[PDB]
Design a protein around this ligand. Sequence first.
Ligand SMILES: [Cl-]
Ligand SMILES: [Cl-]
Length: 100
Amino acid sequence: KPRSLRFTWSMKTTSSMDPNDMMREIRKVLDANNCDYEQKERFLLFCVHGDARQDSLVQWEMEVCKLPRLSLNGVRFKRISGTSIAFKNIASKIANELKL
Ligand SMILES: [Cl-]
Ligand SMILES: [Cl-]
């Protein structure tokens, strides 16, 4: 089951979709944007975009979670590495393209 998490201002991606369907959509959008992901847990991805030999390498977590206090599911994003601008750019693009 996805983890149950407290709603915070960072949570901007919510959905009533089945969490497994959410994961399918997330991987689809990541593929479309040439982001790699490691399947850390059923509902947790370690994502990577860009080129380590340039200035563009960005790593971040994406997690599908339940938000019981909203009766919704959500997608958590958290930076792991990379410049602030590179993270803002790629993570915002992914978030904008998710069809949940
Ligand atoms: Cl908050
Ligand atoms: Cl979040």
